[PDB]
Design a binder for this molecule. Structure first.
Ligand SMILES: Nc1ncnc2c1ncn2[C@@H]1O[C@H](COP(=O)(O)OP(=O)(O)OP(=O)(O)O)[C@@H](O)[C@H]1O
Ligand SMILES: Nc1ncnc2c1ncn2[C@@H]1O[C@H](COP(=O)(O)OP(=O)(O)OP(=O)(O)O)[C@@H](O)[C@H]1O
Ligand SMILES: Nc1ncnc2c1ncn2[C@@H]1O[C@H](COP(=O)(O)OP(=O)(O)O)[C@@H](O)[C@H]1O
Lengths: 605, 476, 352, 41
DNA sequence: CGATCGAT
DNA sequence: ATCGATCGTTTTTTTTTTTTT
């Protein structure tokens, strides 16, 4: 119409007219960037939409279907007109939204929400696999032997015209298995979280549809935010009825968003993206990373730096067919039952890309061994959480007073980084590439004197094998420090109403994702003399089987340092920093005779 | 109609009378209900037959306000139920065999019931903008949130109301006068800061009772379930570890594994205290070892991304080894328990028993006004209505610290650890920053008593006094 | 056949359908050998019924030469004296171990065959494939499926094979058949002729590992097996061979057993769990079949650590199998003393 | 003995000579000697 | 046992 | 419009093995 033509014109005079990011708008070029990677999932801003023209907030809910259609039509008519080069591969488009100032929890949406604009979240549960449906209606005539032809399709409705090449005849027909258009499919079953329940009763759930563009992203137990829209199967068998219609409700997804989203993710500011390389190459940045660990503690540089390096360190370095070495480490702090340790862990999660929360006393380490049937409706399936979170983290707290039948069980995945099961209808296997939280508790009351460590907490012989970042919150009283930190504490309790967390998140996404460091011969013989310094100074006193894993953890520190620099190679610096930290620690966990490598390394130092 | 029939004959034309148009879900008439079941009256509990159950339905506005454990008042809309099929109804069957001149469905109807009114009584509390028995229709922040300022100012102004209120809820009780002033601070608010994305900051505080036998440490709390909202009590062995957890299932009802709630766990912003903390098994014990401090907890073996959370404080019920406080062993051997929880609990207040005749006869002199059925209790200072309303108001204030004792809580705490620099030679003890955290919110709440913001160094000094009380009380 | 490129299951999609392809997966198990044919006659018409697809059966009688007393309403007497017979086996397919199993699990696919690719694939093998991605059923409109199924049109997947082949991961597929040539066997025997082969073979598993050479003079002798020197009485004296090892960690037991898996047929789990043996009950027809997984070492070998770290409810059937090689069964209505020649390697961990 | 027989058998399997001599198996003797002298204490 | 469908 | 001859029509089961705490 005069006005009903102006919808597409508003989109056209939007996507190259409303401009921000200091000129050269996204939707001038963001669409180009969609065509580049061959995605066909352009996404729109409702914020920016209202910043241009508020009008299409009320012109949506009367039929958001037709709004979305009349948009993606514009995307085609622009793309293939200026990118006719595109017109081979897919040549079909639909668009998305990611700005809705609302979260509807479940148990919140009712008959008023019918077939219009929606948002909600939840948790995934078991659902279907990967299937397609149809997309176009065409059959085959047999009275005249012709084709009925292709016919305009309604969402779940018949057409059956008389018009066809068979003298517009041949009411009967048959159908082929080709020359017709297809469309992937997958389903979901959404549950609500165990935090935002009505505090103690059974939860609610409804189902949700995802479509051909949208599959193989979800999984059981994943984090999520979706617009979706409210559905209605228009008849779940109306007749002489129950005391109630047997109706149901679904949501169909337009734009799904993961709320973990552990990939390389963010867009680029036009200039505020070299935020890295205005600063990231300075020499003082060895220690500026420490200032953003956990802004909580006055002391404790050591564990600060250890977690700081090990949050993004890692190298696969798969040699020929032998094995896959490590994207792994097990730093451990066996401190005091009540020095603040369990708080150290949380900021890790609140920055780092993956996780799950688990505390000590988990399962029997089996996990919630199924045989695969369509009896019991599929006999639900998983094996742990390092199966569920690989190349990331999933959390432990207060371990050391747990079932020995778990300390057994986890004792391969750390290092072989491999799972392998049996004891079902299956013996398949699966990948566990992870690292490990620590968070345990000592025995003997609080913490021992410098008297030996094997006496401090009593774990069995074939678990002793691996070990790492050995720190400990040994305590003795300084009143000056008590004054300093307590000022800091009350100051911390006085905030009523160098690095921000705003950025370094992305630095480490970038750092452990893209750059892939190395090593070269510089001084790798010195390592042997220091290993000998272990074996000669430490034989039966302290040297508690610290075999050929922690040594290689030496390399892990060095590679960790250079990725903290985005260096990819190094001189004596990084390795010597590893030697500095290890030299400190293994003096830490001795006897009152505490200075063995100390005396041994003033020449090294 | 309930019995639904797409088939309609015609309106304007002579046209199809079984061939229908398509459907309208767009501009037409829709609505909502749910469906639940109901058991026999617990006010009408006869012998013999079962709890005959009724079917029940709810219209729009009635919805999601029914709930387990609740009694109601319905409509009386008993039904002819447009049912579709059933067995065993082998009575006579009929249908209209029309006029002879020159579709079928078996008929056996069942019963259900419908209702369009609810007063879910015995489940109704109301916060503070509800006008109570005693009110003062005045202007305020909200409707009735403190519109009895006309008195609550007075109940927030006296230097006597501290002790009067300490004595305005123990009329039928007599013992020490330290828990009689400390225990309310458990029910009284904490800190409530407005601050950063560092981590959840807590308002509540751990609280304990120990004492010799038959001291009515139970009767302190037997009433508390009747007292506070959200804060209903039972024991820990009053259920299983389906108190903390739910009842662990291994049979198929909906998806064959269900542990998603508990009994401790549904006490959100009320306390559900427990008795008998000494002989209970070490399962919920190590659960509480972090569930009180790090109120963000998980499980495995059946987890739908298990992340649960405690919310309130606690009340303890210890008793010694021999039943008596025979000073023949250290406290660590007197109770035979662990360290960190003896530090996690920043407040002890043990109730010790003796034998002096005047005391016991004075108790019986309490009893003089326990069965004098007119005047079977002692005088008071402040009625309950105004009391709880002042309590319900005194939170909404944003407590604050800018005080030199806030600056020099460093001083009092430096002295706290100066005098506690020892506590290491004769039966060593441990100091820890949970003590500081607890003193902080303690001082803060002690000024929240004032119906005022902005901490004062009086509160620090009394808090220091009370911490000194507790720690020297820990002395053997 | 071709050498174009292998694809991955994560992309086998609605575009990739009715279309020739190439992949590379791995095999799990697949069916027995049922039946299929192409055409047949019927007495009602006496014509070999010719079909394009590999059902409609129309109305008219064709025993109409009865006068006016004809036989309508589909009177079809299938004459399998006159029918045919080809094969049908339903091969299977799991996806790779590196191609989106990472934050997920691996899916898989089921297959099909007609004539000569039965007796072609034993499961637990690495394939290269050319097949085709197509369906079995059809329909979009509001004839919505089942009871509460099919919002619109979901039909099912599978593939049929047009020209499976196999893998050459060095010797990817060298397990049962022989496409090997006289040059190969000359090579073999002339290395056997070489009297410097065993000590050279003491250095085949440790090209990155040091030491343990007296330890390794028979770590591979395990693999070859000796002799199943059976006798006319019972005394089938024990064929295969078994080994123990245990000691301080930090000494490369795990990687070594991974390699002994690497170097024809083998598997690895360890504790807490290959294989009671498995008597299930068929969800189709509810019969009690036996999947029965040392069967997958029926000539291969086994390696495990974690004998120590798994309880004794499951050690005894395997305590026993490896003295008689006959997996017994007596549980439900079956007494099928199964058997299979597996060995085993035993690593361990001593407490103290 | 019932197993060391299989060690001889493995050796002859390698070199393909069918009939195996005791010098071929002195190697076997020295290898299970590891087990003997292990459980020697 | 029900609807389709043809003619009278 | 009416009657009659045409077309097409189908539903029944309970229990055993391994697994997890
Ligand atoms: N530098 C600090 N900043 C803030 N809080 C601190 C600091 N040092 C100690 N704490 C406090 O000490 C308390 C330690 O208890 P936390 O919740 O950490 O349990 P935990 O120490 O992990 O004990 P456990 O692991 O034995 O259960 C925390 O409340 C923490 O706030
Ligand atoms: N002597 C060695 N030479 C070369 N690499 C070694 C040596 N010893 C160990 N390594 C390396 O150290 C790692 C040892 O891990 P592995 O899983 O073998 O532990 P383990 O010896 O099996 O201990 P456990 O039996 O307690 O698991 C391997 O990745 C291996 O490559
Ligand atoms: N000061 C008091 N006020 C009221 N009742 C008291 C007081 N002192 C003791 N009692 C009575 O003593 C009894 C104490 O028993 P209780 O302490 O509950 O047993 P237990 O020692 O097993 O907890 C209570 O029934 C209570 O009525």
């Amino acid at each position: 119409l005069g006005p009903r033509t102006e919808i597409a014109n508003r989109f056209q005079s939007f996507l190259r007219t409303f401009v921000d990011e200091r000129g050269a708008y996204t939707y001038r070029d963001r669409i180009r960037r969609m065509c580049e990677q061959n995605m066909s999932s352009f996404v729109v801003s409702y914020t920016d939409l209202a910043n241009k023209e508020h009008v299409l907030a009320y012109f949506l809910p009367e039929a958001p279907f037709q709004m979305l259609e009349i948009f993606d039509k514009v995307a085609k008519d622009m793309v293939l007109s200026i990118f006719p080069t595109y017109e081979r591969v897919t040549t079909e488009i639909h668009v998305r939204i990611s700005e809705l100032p609302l979260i509807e929890e479940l148990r919140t949406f009712r008959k008023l929400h019918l077939n219009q604009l929606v948002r909600t979240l939840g948790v995934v549960t078991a659902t279907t696999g990967v299937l397609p449906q149809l997309s176009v209606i065409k059959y085959d005539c047999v009275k005249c032997g012709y084709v009925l032809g292709p016919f305009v399709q309604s969402q779940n409705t018949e057409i059956k015209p008389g018009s066809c090449p068979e003298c517009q005849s041949t009411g009967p027909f048959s159908i082929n298995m080709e020359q017709t258009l297809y469309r992937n499919y997958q389903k979901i079953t959404l549950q609500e979280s165990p935090g935002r329940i009505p505090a103690g009763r059974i939860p609610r759930s409804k189902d949700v549809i995802l479509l051909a563009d949208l599959c193989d992203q979800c999984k059981p137990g994943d984090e999520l935010e979706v617009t979706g829209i409210y559905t209605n199967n228009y008849d779940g068998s109306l007749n002489t009825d129950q005391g109630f219609p047997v109706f149901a409700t679904v949501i169909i997804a337009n734009h799904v968003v993961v709320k973990d989203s552990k990939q390389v993710v963010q867009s680029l500011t036009d200039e505020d993206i070299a935020t890295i390389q205005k600063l990231s190459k300075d020499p003082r940045i060895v220690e500026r990373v420490v200032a953003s660990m956990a802004p909580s503690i006055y002391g404790h540089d050591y564990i600060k730096r250890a977690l700081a390096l090990a949050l993004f360190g890692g190298e696969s370095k798969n040699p020929g067919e032998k094995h896959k070495v490590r994207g792994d480490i097990n730093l451990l702090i066996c401190g005091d039952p009540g020095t603040a340790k369990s708080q150290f862990l949380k900021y890790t999660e609140k920055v780092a890309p993956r996780a799950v929360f688990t505390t000590g006393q988990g399962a029997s380490a089996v996990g919630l061994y199924v045989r695969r049937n369509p009896v019991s409706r599929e006999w639900t399936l998983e094996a742990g959480a390092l199966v569920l979170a690989d190349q990331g983290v999933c959390l432990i707290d207060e371990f050391d007073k747990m079932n020995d039948q778990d300390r057994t069980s986890i004792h391969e995945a750390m290092e072989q980084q491999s799972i392998s099961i049996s004891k079902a209808g299956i013996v398949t296997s699966l990948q566990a590439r992870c690292t490990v939280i620590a968070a345990a508790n000592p025995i003997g009351g609080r913490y021992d004197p410098s008297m030996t460590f094997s006496e401090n907490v009593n774990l069995s012989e074939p678990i002793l094998s691996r070990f790492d970042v050995l720190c400990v919150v040994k305590d003795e009283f300084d009143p000056m420090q008590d004054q300093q930190l307590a000022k800091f504490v009350v100051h911390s309790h006085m905030k009523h109403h160098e690095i921000p967390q705003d950025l370094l998140r992305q630095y480490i996404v970038y750092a452990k994702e893209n750059i892939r460091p190395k090593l070269t011969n510089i001084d790798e013989d010195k390592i042997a003399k220091m290993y000998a310094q272990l074996r000669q100074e430490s034989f039966a006193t302290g040297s508690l089987p610290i075999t050929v894993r922690h040594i290689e953890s030496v390399i892990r520190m060095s590679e960790a340092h250079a990725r903290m620099h985005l260096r990819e190679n190094v001189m004596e610096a990084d390795v010597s920093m590893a030697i500095r930290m290890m030299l400190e620690s293994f003096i830490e966990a001795q006897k009152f005779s505490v200075m063995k490598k100390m005396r041994s390394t003033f020449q090294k130092y | 109609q309930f019995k639904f029939t797409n088939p309609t004959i015609c309106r304007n034309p002579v046209c199809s009378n079984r061939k229908r148009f398509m459907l309208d879900v767009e501009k037409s008439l829709f609505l909502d209900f749910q469906k639940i079941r109901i058991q026999e009256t617990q006010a009408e509990l006869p012998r013999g037959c079962i709890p005959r159950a009724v079917e029940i339905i709810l219209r729009s506005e009635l919805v999601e306000t029914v709930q387990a454990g609740d009694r109601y008042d319905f409509t009386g809309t008993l039904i002819v139920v447009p049912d579709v099929s059933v067995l065993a109804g082998v009575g006579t069957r009929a249908e209209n065999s029309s006029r002879h001149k020159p579709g079928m469905r078996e008929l056996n109807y069942r019963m259900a019931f419908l209702a369009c009114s609810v007063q879910a009584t015995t489940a109704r509390f109301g916060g503070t903008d509800l006008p109570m028995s005693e009110v003062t229709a005045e202007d305020m922040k909200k409707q009735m949130t403190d519109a009895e300022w006309h008195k609550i100012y007075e109940m927030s102004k006296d230097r006597n109301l501290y002790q009067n209120l300490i004595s305005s809820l123990f009329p039928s009780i007599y013992g020490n006068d330290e828990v009689k002033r400390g225990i309310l601070l458990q029910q009284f608010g904490g800190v409530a800061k407005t601050t950063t994305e560092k981590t959840s900051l807590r308002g509540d505080i751990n609280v304990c009772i120990v004492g010799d036998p038959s001291t009515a440490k139970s009767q302190f709390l037997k009433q508390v379930s009747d007292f506070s909202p959200r804060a209903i009590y039972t024991s820990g062995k009053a259920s299983s570890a389906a108190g903390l957890t739910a009842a662990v299932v291994r049979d198929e009802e909906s998806f064959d594994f269900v542990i998603e709630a508990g009994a401790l766990m549904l006490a959100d912003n009320g306390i559900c205290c427990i008795d008998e903390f000494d002989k209970m098994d070490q399962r919920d014990q190590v659960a509480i070892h972090e569930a009180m401090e790090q109120q963000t907890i998980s499980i495995a073996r059946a987890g739908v991304r298990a992340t649960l959370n405690a919310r309130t404080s606690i009340l303890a019920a210890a008793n010694p080894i021999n039943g008596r406080y025979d000073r023949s062993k250290s406290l660590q051997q007197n109770i035979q328990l662990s360290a960190p929880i003896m530090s996690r609990f920043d407040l002890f207040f043990i109730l010790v028993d003796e034998c002096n005749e005047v005391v016991d006869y004075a108790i019986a002199r309490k009893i003089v006004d326990l069965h004098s059925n007119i005047e079977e209790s002692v005088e008071r200072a402040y009625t309950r209505e105004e009391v709880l309303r002042y309590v319900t108001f005194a939170r909404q204030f944003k407590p604050v610290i800018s005080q030199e004792a806030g600056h020099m809580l460093v001083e009092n705490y430096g002295h706290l650890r100066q005098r506690d620099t020892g506590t290491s030679g004769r039966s060593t003890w441990r100091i820890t920053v949970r003590q500081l955290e607890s003193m902080i919110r303690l001082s803060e709440a002690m000024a929240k008593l004032e119906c005022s913001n902005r901490v004062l160094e009086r509160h620090v000094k009394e808090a220091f006094r009370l911490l000194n009380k507790s720690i020297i009380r820990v002395e053997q | 056949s071709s050498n174009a490129n292998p694809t991955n299951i994560r992309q086998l999609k609605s575009d990739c359908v009715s279309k020739l392809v190439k992949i590379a997966g791995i095999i799990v198990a697949a069916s027995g050998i049922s039946a299929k044919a192409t055409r047949m006659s019927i007495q009602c018409l006496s014509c070999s019924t010719v079909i394009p697809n590999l059902y409609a059966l129309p109305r008219k009688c064709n025993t109409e030469q009865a006068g006016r007393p004809k036989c309508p309403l589909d009177p079809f007497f299938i004459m399998p004296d006159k029918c045919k017979c080809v094969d049908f086996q339903t091969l299977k397919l799991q996806e790779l171990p590196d191609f989106v199993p990472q934050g997920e699990i691996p899916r898989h696919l089921q297959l099909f065959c007609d004539r000569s690719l039965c007796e072609r694939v034993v499961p637990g093998n690495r394939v290269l494939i050319q097949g085709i991605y197509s369906i079995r059923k059809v329909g979009k409109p509001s004839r919505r499926d089942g009871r509460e199924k099919a919002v619109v049109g979901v039909r099912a997947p599978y593939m049929r094979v047009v020209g499976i082949t196999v893998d050459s991961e060095g010797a990817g597929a060298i397990s049962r058949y022989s496409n090997i040539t006289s040059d190969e066997e000359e090579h073999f025997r002339r290395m056997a002729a070489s009297g410097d082969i065993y000590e050279r073979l003491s250095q085949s598993l440790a090209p990155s590992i040091f030491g343990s050479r007296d330890i390794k003079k028979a770590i591979t002798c395990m693999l070859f097996g000796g002799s199943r020197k059976r006798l006319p009485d019972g005394l089938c004296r024990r064929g295969d061979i078994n080994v123990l090892l245990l000691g301080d960690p930090g000494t490369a037991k795990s990687q070594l057993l991974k390699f002994v898996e690497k170097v024809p047929i083998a598997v690895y789990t360890s504790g807490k769990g290959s294989s009671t043996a498995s008597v299930m009950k068929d969800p189709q027809t509810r019969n009690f079949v036996m999947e029965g997984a040392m069967v997958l070492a029926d000539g291969g070998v086994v390696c495990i650590d974690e004998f120590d770290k798994m309880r004794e409810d499951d050690r005894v059937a395997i305590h026993e199998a490896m003295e008689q090689q006959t997996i017994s069964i007596a549980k439900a209505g079956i007494t099928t003393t199964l058997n299979s020649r597996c060995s085993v390697l035993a690593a361990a961990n001593s407490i103290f | 003995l019932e197993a060391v027989i299989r060690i001889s058998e493995s050796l002859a399997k390698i070199r393909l000579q069918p009939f195996a001599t005791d010098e071929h198996v002195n190697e076997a003797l020295r290898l299970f000697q590891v087990s003997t002298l292990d459980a020697a204490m």
